[PDB]
Amino acid sequence: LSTAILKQKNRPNRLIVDEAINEDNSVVSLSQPKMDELQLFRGDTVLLKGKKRREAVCIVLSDDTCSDEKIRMNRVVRNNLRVRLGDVISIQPCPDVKYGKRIHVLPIDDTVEGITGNLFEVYLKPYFLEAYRPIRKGDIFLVRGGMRAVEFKVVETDPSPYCIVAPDTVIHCEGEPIKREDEEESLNEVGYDDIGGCRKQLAQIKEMVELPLRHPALFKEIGVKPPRGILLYGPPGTGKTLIARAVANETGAFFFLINGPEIMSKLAGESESNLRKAFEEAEKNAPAIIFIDELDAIAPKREKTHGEVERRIVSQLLTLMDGLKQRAHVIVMAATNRPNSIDPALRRFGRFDREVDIGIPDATGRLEILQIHTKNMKLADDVDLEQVANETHGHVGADLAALCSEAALQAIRKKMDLIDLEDETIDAEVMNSLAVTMDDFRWALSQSNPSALRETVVEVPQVTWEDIGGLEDVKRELQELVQYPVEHPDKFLKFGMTPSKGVLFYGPPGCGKTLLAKAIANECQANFISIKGPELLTMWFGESEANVREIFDKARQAAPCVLFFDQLDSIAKARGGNIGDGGGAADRVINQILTEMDGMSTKKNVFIIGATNRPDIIDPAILRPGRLDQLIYIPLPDEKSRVAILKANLRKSPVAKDVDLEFLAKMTNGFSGADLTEICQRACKLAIRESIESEIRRERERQPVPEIRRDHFEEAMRFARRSVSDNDIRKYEMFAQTLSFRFPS
């Protein structure tokens, strides 16, 4: 499975973090069956591993009230392992822990601010007297006594790293106090849990980076060599640098970070020296990871570069990439937001040959990002991260971070009156009053401008079959065409028939062709790419055929994908229709589409769908085998289908049950689904106007309309008119006709 590597295992060592009844900063409690399963004795020293490279040592004890799958755990060592209640930690035996020869500790600034007494005698000596506490370098532990409990950081141990505080162990705390800034920076370091909406990408990165270095013998045994170059790409602000930081803080391998402007800001001969030194340092500390952030800064296209030194730097990078012998256990990672700007030589074999797309997050992904970014943010109960996530189409993670910052700024604006710039300090009542409400998020949404609105949307559509009324035979035919090869390929192989991978929807406008394409993409849970008429017209007017290939390339990277071409006749009408131009049924954009379809015919998991309201003026070459060779007529709905359409459109609108949708459908004989949606929208508009006017009337008098009613629908049927005439219907009929026989008995 694609994300099977992200699965952490149901193992006896894995334990759920639980609160501690009576536990000091040196012990943890487990259930007796858990010690029996783990062969752990009471009083044994045990090593605990948690999130973000964190390790600690404790004393394992028995607790009859402790669950088998849980470990009792006080707050101090929870802070040490950077874990919260309900998190999962790993417990192992920690043998051969020797008595400490000498330990150097340092207090935290605010815990010692105002403390002038002897730290040793007041705090450390009673805390470490006849206790034999196990400690680790970098541990943070809180000590009682004095007027005020003081937190200390174990900055040095001998023997290292783990030592027992014996009575003869020399403890000293003389040195520069550990500042709170360092502790906060260490606490807020980025791990994998700080990335949202990139579950596929995280799994792929672990498979291609962490796994080969973690277990090289795994790939050696099966006789394959792991890729050497992984290139992260995506639009700016998608989290490539954040993923780099997470990998750096989460990896056991040696990590070296290289920035583009880092290298390019140095003098000629120092950039090359730094690059070579980085590669040599990685090779010396194998297994190692080299991350080159902003690769396009150092390696643009060599021919399109004018600097001599720049070309020399690109050549040096190519040579260093080729210098790895696949036993150096060095994996080079790179991030760029302009993958095309990279020199193509770097994308060859033995180089950055693997590519991971950190794309634009969907609604679930951006909800995850919002939850991550607001986890340490003071919020109110009215804040619905659901609603913000649904309303932030086109936002990337950086845009969502800016949105949260602007919401907080609006929250501060709401308290501006109690806050003065000239004031040396801010009252604590204002401080604890400060919270980010839903109104602040709404204002930030109103003021936010997304950076990825012009990017092509590649996602699974929300439209399902309940969103479509009628068309049951069309639904069954689409399901067969798209899913039978997927679900029963052996049946197609047995009869020797290659399935058709292209369908054209044709019919009157507003009958559900776009809905059908979206729904068939949704049922298969495949990505959906929609190319509308204005985009084809943009390529036609600008004479920019070459962009068509780009579209198909996206469909390849997004497979399984449904490539949908809506309004294939847009260029045909733009030329004037059937008799508009002297030329006949051949244009540049559709020609490139034909070539790209022929190229895509070998990609099994990309299904191409076309839609047109004017099948007569469509280029016939698109209906040839290997192209949209299946044809489905989407007709005007009949009365039952019209009832279904009216019911589907009114699901989200409160409608009184006295309204009879069957009569509405039977009276709208020649109406399309779009016309019925227009009727429903106008009825809702009338109801909203009535409710607003009634609320205004009451708001005046002090100084109704809960549902749409039958009079609303009648007043909507004033303006309702059928968009498709009988002429058009008949034209589709002779198109369908122009698409008895028995064997002798």
Ligand X SMILES: Cc1cc(OCc2nnc(SC3CCCC3)n2-c2cccnc2)ccc1-c1ccc(S(C)(=O)=O)cc1
Binding annotation for ATP: 236-242, 337, 373, 510-515
Strands 606-612 and 630-633: what pairing? unpaired
Beta bridge partner(s), residue 612: 506
Asked if 378 interacts with a copy of itself (CB under 8 A), we say yes
Helix axes 472-487, 513-523, angle to 10 degrees: 30
Q: For a copy of itself, which is the closer residue by CB, 61 or 345?
A: 345
- Return the one option of a copy of itself, ligand ATP, Mg ion, none that residue 736 interacts with (CB less than 5 to 8 A, by type): none
Range 337-370 burial, b when 16+ CB lie within 10 A, else e: bebeebbebbeeeebbebbbbbbbbbbebbbbbb
Q: Tell which positions 154-213 bind ligand X, by CB under 6 A.
A: none
* Rounded least distance, CB 618 to ligand ATP, Å: 14
- Select the residue whose beta carbon is closest to Mg ion and give its number: 241
What are the residue ranges of helices labelled H in 558-624? 570-574, 588-600
Q: For ligand X, which is the closer residue by CB, 224 or 493?
A: 493
* Rounded least distance, CB 116 to a copy of itself, Å: 24
Strands 330-336 and 527-531: what pairing? unpaired
Asked if 514 interacts with Mg ion (CB under 5 A), we say yes
CA–CA separation, 348 and 346 (whole Å): 6
- Return the one option of ligand ATP, a copy of itself, Mg ion, none that residue 440 interacts with (CB less than 5 to 8 A, by type): none
SS3 string, 57-83, reads EEEEEECCCCCCCEEEECHHHHHHCCC
Size of the site for a copy of itself (CB under 8 A): 172
* Rounded least distance, CB 565 to a copy of itself, Å: 16
CA–CA separation, 277 and 266 (whole Å): 14
Strands 150-158 and 140-143: what pairing? antiparallel
> Which three-class secondary structure state does DSSP give residue 452?
coil
Range 518-537 burial, b when 16+ CB lie within 10 A, else e: bbbbbbbebbbbbbebebbb
Which residue in 114, 496, 582, 625 binds ligand X (CB under 6 A)? 496
Q: Tell which positions 565-604 bind ligand X, by CB under 6 A.
A: 604
- Return the one option of Mg ion, a copy of itself, ligand X, none that residue 524 interacts with (CB less than 5 to 8 A, by type): ligand X
> Residues 560-589 vs a copy of itself: string with x where CB under 8 A?
----------x--xxxxx--xxxxxxxxx-
**Cα Rg of the chain, angstroms:** 33
**Which region among 104-112, 200-208, 393-401, 510-518 touches Mg ion (by CB under 5 A)?**
510-518
Q: For ligand X, which is the closer residue by CB, 99 or 492?
A: 492
Q: Tell which positions 32-61 bind a copy of itself, by CB under 8 A.
A: 49
Task: Quote the DSSP letter at residue 725.
Answer: -
Asked if 491 interacts with a copy of itself (CB under 8 A), we say yes
List contacts with ligand ATP (CB under 6 A): 194-198, 236-242, 335, 337, 348-349, 369, 372, 397-398, 401, 468-471, 509-515, 611, 613, 637, 645, 648, 673-674, 677
- The letter for the amino acid at 592 is Q
Asked if 567 interacts with Mg ion (CB under 5 A), we say no
Q: Are 536 and 567 in contact (CB under 8 A)?
A: yes
- Locate breaks in the chain with C to N over 2.5 A; list the residue preceding each: 703, 739
> Which three-class secondary structure state does DSSP give residue 390?
helix
Q: Are 499 and 662 in contact (CB under 8 A)?
A: no
- Return the one option of Mg ion, ligand ATP, ligand X, none that residue 229 interacts with (CB less than 5 to 8 A, by type): none
Asked if 380 interacts with a copy of itself (CB under 8 A), we say no
**Which region among 148-156, 168-176, 238-246, 486-494 touches ligand X (by CB under 6 A)?**
486-494
Angle at alpha carbon of residue 389, lines to 383 and 392, rounded to 5°: 120
**Which region among 80-88, 410-418, 513-521, 623-631 touches Mg ion (by CB under 5 A)?**
513-521
Asked if 656 interacts with ligand X (CB under 6 A), we say no
**Which region among 74-82, 97-105, 158-166, 718-726 touches a copy of itself (by CB under 8 A)?**
718-726
Asked if 526 interacts with ligand X (CB under 6 A), we say yes
Q: For ligand ATP, which is the closer residue by CB, 151 or 399?
A: 399
Asked if 307 interacts with a copy of itself (CB under 8 A), we say yes
Q: For a copy of itself, which is the closer residue by CB, 121 or 711?
A: 711
CA–CA separation, 12 and 568 (whole Å): 60
Task: Quote the DSSP letter at residue 471.
Answer: -
**Which region among 144-152, 461-469, 556-564, 609-617 touches a copy of itself (by CB under 8 A)?**
556-564
The label of the residue with tokens 């919002």 reads: 370
Q: For ligand ATP, which is the closer residue by CB, 111 or 241?
A: 241
* Rounded least distance, CB 559 to ligand X, Å: 7
CA–CA separation, 231 and 679 (whole Å): 52
Q: For ligand ATP, which is the closer residue by CB, 20 or 516?
A: 516
The enclosing H or E element of 263 equals: helix 260-264
CA–CA separation, 246 and 194 (whole Å): 8
- Return the one option of a copy of itself, ligand X, Mg ion, none that residue 514 interacts with (CB less than 5 to 8 A, by type): Mg ion
**Which region among 292-300, 494-502, 618-626, 701-709 touches ligand X (by CB under 6 A)?**
494-502
* Rounded least distance, CB 482 to ligand X, Å: 5
CA–CA separation, 209 and 232 (whole Å): 12
CA–CA separation, 694 and 704 (whole Å): 7
CA–CA separation, 255 and 285 (whole Å): 9
Asked if 363 interacts with ligand X (CB under 6 A), we say no
* Rounded least distance, CB 493 to ligand X, Å: 5
> Which three-class secondary structure state does DSSP give residue 536?
helix
Which residue in 652, 657, 700, 702 binds a copy of itself (CB under 8 A)? 652
> Residues 78-107 vs a copy of itself: string with x where CB under 8 A?
------------x-----------------
CA–CA separation, 53 and 81 (whole Å): 9
CA–CA separation, 30 and 730 (whole Å): 79
* Rounded least distance, CB 345 to ligand ATP, Å: 8
Q: For a copy of itself, which is the closer residue by CB, 378 or 697?
A: 378
Asked if 241 interacts with Mg ion (CB under 5 A), we say yes
* Rounded least distance, CB 223 to a copy of itself, Å: 4
- The letter for the amino acid at 464 is T
Q: For ligand ATP, which is the closer residue by CB, 329 or 395?
A: 395
What are the residue ranges of helices labelled H in 324-471? 363-373, 385-390, 397-413, 428-433, 438-447
CA–CA separation, 419 and 200 (whole Å): 45
- Return the one option of Mg ion, ligand X, a copy of itself, none that residue 654 interacts with (CB less than 5 to 8 A, by type): a copy of itself
Asked if 227 interacts with a copy of itself (CB under 8 A), we say yes
- The letter for the amino acid at 384 is D
Asked if 628 interacts with ligand X (CB under 6 A), we say no
Asked if 562 interacts with ligand X (CB under 6 A), we say yes
Asked if 486 interacts with ligand X (CB under 6 A), we say yes
> Which three-class secondary structure state does DSSP give residue 378?
coil
**Taking Cα atoms as reference points, which of 548, 547, 563 lies closest to residue 603?**
563
* Residue partners of 608: CB distance under 8 A and separation at least 6: 501, 502, 503, 555, 562, 563, 564, 565, 597, 600, 628
Question: Would you tell me which residues interact with ligand X (CB under 6 A)?
Answer: 482, 485-486, 489, 492-493, 496, 498-499, 501, 524, 526, 560, 562, 604-605, 607
